Ligand binder design. Structure first.
Ligand SMILES: [Mg+2]
Ligand SMILES: [Mg+2]
Ligand SMILES: [Mg+2]
Ligand SMILES: [Mg+2]
Ligand SMILES: [Mg+2]
Ligand SMILES: [Mg+2]
Ligand SMILES: [Mg+2]
Ligand SMILES: [Mg+2]
Ligand SMILES: [Mg+2]
Ligand SMILES: [Mg+2]
Ligand SMILES: [Mg+2]
Ligand SMILES: [Mg+2]
Ligand SMILES: [Mg+2]
Ligand SMILES: [Mg+2]
Ligand SMILES: [Mg+2]
Ligand SMILES: [Mg+2]
Ligand SMILES: [Mg+2]
Ligand SMILES: [Mg+2]
Ligand SMILES: [Mg+2]
Ligand SMILES: [Mg+2]
Ligand SMILES: [Mg+2]
Ligand SMILES: [Mg+2]
Ligand SMILES: [Mg+2]
Ligand SMILES: [Mg+2]
Ligand SMILES: [Mg+2]
Ligand SMILES: [Mg+2]
Ligand SMILES: [Mg+2]
Ligand SMILES: [Mg+2]
Ligand SMILES: [Mg+2]
Ligand SMILES: [Mg+2]
Lengths: 204, 147, 102
RNA sequence: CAGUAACGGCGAGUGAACAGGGAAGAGCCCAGCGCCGAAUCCCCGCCCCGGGGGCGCGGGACAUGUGGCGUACGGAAGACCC
RNA sequence: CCCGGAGUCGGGUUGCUUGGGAAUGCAGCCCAAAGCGGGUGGUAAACUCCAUCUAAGGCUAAAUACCGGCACGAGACCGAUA
RNA sequence: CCGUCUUGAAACACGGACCAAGGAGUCUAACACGUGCGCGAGUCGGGGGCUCGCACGAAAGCCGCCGUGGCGCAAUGAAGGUGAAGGCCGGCCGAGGUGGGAUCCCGAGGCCUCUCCAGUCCGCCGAGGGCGCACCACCGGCCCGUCUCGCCCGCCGCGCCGG
RNA sequence: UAGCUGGUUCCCUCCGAAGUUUCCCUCAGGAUAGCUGGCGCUCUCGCAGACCCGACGCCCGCCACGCAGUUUUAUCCGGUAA
RNA sequence: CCGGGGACAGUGCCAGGUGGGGAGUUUGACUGGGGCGGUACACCUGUCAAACGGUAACGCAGGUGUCCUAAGGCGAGCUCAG
């Protein structure tokens, strides 16, 4: 019974719940078990950078999150073509192709080509036969810097460029900002119906 | 702690705080929110008016991302920048107004509650109130729209 | 200035420069090839027509084409599958009328 | 996200997803279309290593389609450059 | 030059199912396809732009579950009517 | 003659031969208010990650705007949507006014010393007067929904447009 | 499952009821307002001048507000008893 | 195989009828015990009701689920039962 004042509660416990209860008492056990498999994998791949391949810069996909930017699944084939590396050598180098990602814009295309070229100058490629370097790297380069990289490979920046102060010109000072939103919200609302009234009045 | 509860004080008294006449029974009055129109009607009408019935239009698959618009009032607008931004703009001989992009601070609409300190500023937002964009022009500043 | 890039209205959004590309090759699924056109009309001249198609062509001989549209729509199900079934069958009758005039 | 959109004698009650953040992270293969003298596989017998390898005018499967190349991120064949 | 999975999709109707609401999925039965086509674009319909993916073939580690089993370790637990 | 239900039990109401031992408001979730603590327009790692080799330690510490996210800082409308500054004279000020209002401030006047005369330096009482906290009642003001009346203004689009 | 029986385990201290209103397929029950307790909070009188000691300002006169199962003084109201 | 039926029967799916053979459920309340009768179950007047208001019984005497383009609204002129 409701007593005097309070919320109308609707608790979801009519469905034999205490047979299905997931306790979490193995939680510090599995933080140890996962961590011992990070440390074990990172010494299997001994100079390879402990975290997997490089990931692209990906813009987040809605109106709530499109100002921030994250790392994606992989590089698109159009980014691989104009950075000039084959789509089947790139996983052997640690690049992670994503074959189903489109490139609609140009400056997000260029920001990942610039990421790929800057990676390719940065990685150190050991030869197949260490007794005979074919095309990979100089043996001096493989000695004093052959360490494993921890954390993500060149993690994704949220760069906010600082615009400096300036002088408000007179016409920018005279800009009807609220009125231009209400007219733009009204023109798109009435666009189809004014075009219909225009084409029927072409005859009558 | 179980040593501070009424059960330890009620450990000699027969009814255990629930009365000899009435009793403590299982569910006298229904279970849950039973009876909100029939015998618990006065409790729902006194305290939760509006609980029974439909009002308004249904909208399937509400995606709350596409109606995201966090607002900042006009009086907490200089807190989005550092204090040497506001102070050096006041000392400036040439009329240079600093820029306040509210979108990198996580706001989309500027609302006009408050009062601005008397110095020009350029505010870049996605949306403005009517009287929020005329408390910027009266202080001598400018509104700029960003998509 | 004037015409700030605006988040509402007809011309809205962040004003980006689109690149043009060769489209994804999966976009041409079901485009008709020369060779599979040749297979698909060898089959028709050797199998004929279904009895609803053969009946719908009879309603199209007598210029009763609203009823033939309703009949095809009753048997294949959709209005847009029916009105391209009909103009397919009308191209059969337009071809057979022309081939029998000579 | 969320006891939310929504369901519901719209009563009691029920009730997810996408975005965001993490753990982990890996991609591929045919048929078909085609070209390659069926270029393919199983079995048996003999011969050399502890299944490999090599023989058999040895059987059989298989053109009612085995193998290679090749699959939507295109692919192939030609020239040309490397 | 070469390019793709049909009693399948899809439509109707019946039944169960789902948050899925003029029908979310699944099934029966009848109808039953197309190839610039087809599917999806959460209100039934016609019209038209646009976006998106390529169904009706197949394989796949890791992160995940574990009151049974083998073998261990521990506990602000019980102490022989527990 | 005790427990019990009852208007009413010593009862010809029920239960109880006697003894030992066991024996009944718990735990989880969600709320509400009250209280304690920490931080405070913010707050919180809860999930994950990092740290001599895991007695204790399955603990403890750390991260950084990993703050993603929750709640809070803005409401109202079914929805499109819109969305909280005045006061004093263009200039100054920055949430209005009346009534009460703990406290604090001023204070005429008094208050003593062996004795007056002049003066000085602090203390005590104090009529009246002022600024008035929180909270209360009232009156105005602002935002959104909706009515009734009404006249102006705006322009890249002169509109079944915007304000 | 039970709106129905039965039982519900230590001591002292303080406070201390209700069987009535309204609604309910309500009459062996609940919601509702009364009645109770707890937690406070906002104020008032003020504490009283070390032992002392009615006092110390302006001939008189005066000693805060509010409040009440009460009377007084005004003044309305009523149709019982007779 | 020989006869006999035969595109009917039959089966599958939908639709209409029938269907206590079978299933599930319900079968008000108040009440001088219950049932029967009544409705004191939503309303209205007079009384009870104890001269403010409030006040109970299956207390008394009655009414009600309608009627009305005037039987509503103004104005004027009239005066009724006997
Ligand atoms: Mg990882
Ligand atoms: Mg109690
Ligand atoms: Mg009891
Ligand atoms: Mg009780
Ligand atoms: Mg009782
Ligand atoms: Mg919440
Ligand atoms: Mg369910
Ligand atoms: Mg083949
Ligand atoms: Mg269901
Ligand atoms: Mg729609
Ligand atoms: Mg599988
Ligand atoms: Mg024993
Ligand atoms: Mg024993
Ligand atoms: Mg035992
Ligand atoms: Mg013993
Ligand atoms: Mg009795
Ligand atoms: Mg007794
Ligand atoms: Mg007796
Ligand atoms: Mg008894
Ligand atoms: Mg006995
Ligand atoms: Mg015992
Ligand atoms: Mg609290
Ligand atoms: Mg009962
Ligand atoms: Mg009883
Ligand atoms: Mg009377
Ligand atoms: Mg009398
Ligand atoms: Mg029956
Ligand atoms: Mg009865
Ligand atoms: Mg009286
Ligand atoms: Mg008259």
């Amino acid at each position: 019974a409701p007593s005097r004042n309070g919320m109308v509660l609707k608790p979801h416990f009519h469905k034999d719940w205490q047979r299905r209860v997931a306790t979490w008492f193995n939680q510090p056990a599995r933080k140890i078990r996962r961590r011992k498999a990070r440390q074990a994998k990172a010494r299997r791949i001994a100079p390879r950078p402990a975290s997997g391949p490089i990931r692209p810069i990906v813009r987040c996909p809605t109106v709530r999150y499109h100002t921030k930017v994250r790392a994606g699944r992989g590089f698109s084939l159009e980014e691989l073509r104009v950075a000039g590396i084959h789509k089947k050598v790139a996983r052997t180098i640690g690049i992670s192709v994503d074959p189903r990602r489109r490139n609609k814009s140009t400056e997000s295309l260029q920001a990942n080509v610039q990421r790929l070229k800057e990676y390719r100058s940065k990685l150190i490629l050991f030869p197949r036969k260490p007794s005979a370097p074919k095309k990979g790297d100089s043996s001096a380069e493989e000695l004093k810097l052959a360490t494993q990289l921890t954390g993500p490979v060149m993690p994704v920046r949220n760069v906010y460029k600082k615009e400096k102060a300036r002088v408000i010109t007179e016409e920018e000072k005279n800009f009807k900002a609220f009125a231009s939103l209400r007219m733009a919200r009204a023109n798109a609302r009435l666009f189809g119906i004014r075009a219909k009234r225009a084409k029927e009045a072409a005859e009558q | 702690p179980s040593r501070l509860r009424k059960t330890r004080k009620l450990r000699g008294h027969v009814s255990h705080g629930h009365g000899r006449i009435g009793k403590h029974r299982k569910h006298p009055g229904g279970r849950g929110n039973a009876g909100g129109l029939h015998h618990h009607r006065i409790n729902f009408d006194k305290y939760h008016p509006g609980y029974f019935g439909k009002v308004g239009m249904k909208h399937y698959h509400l995606k709350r991302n596409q109606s995201f618009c966090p607002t900042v009032n006009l009086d907490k607008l200089w807190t989005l920048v550092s204090e040497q931004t506001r102070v050096n703009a006041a000392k400036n001989k040439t009329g240079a107004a600093p820029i306040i992009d509210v979108v990198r601070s996580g706001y989309y609409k500027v609302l006009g509650k408050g009062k601005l300190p008397k110095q020009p500023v350029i505010v870049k937002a996605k949306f403005f109130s009517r009287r929020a964009e005329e408390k910027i022009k009266s202080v001598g500043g400018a509104c700029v729209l960003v998509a | 200035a004037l015409r700030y890039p605006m988040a509402v209205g007809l011309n809205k959004g962040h004003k980006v420069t689109k690149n043009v590309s060769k489209p994804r090759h999966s976009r041409r699924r079901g485009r008709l090839t020369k060779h599979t056109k040749f297979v698909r009309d060898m089959i028709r001249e050797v199998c004929g027509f279904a009895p609803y198609e053969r009946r719908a062509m009879e309603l199209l001989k007598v210029s009763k084409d609203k009823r033939a549209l309703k009949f095809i729509k009753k048997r294949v199900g959709t209005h847009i599958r029916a009105k391209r079934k009909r103009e397919e069958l009308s191209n059969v009758l337009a071809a057979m009328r022309k081939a029998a005039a000579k």
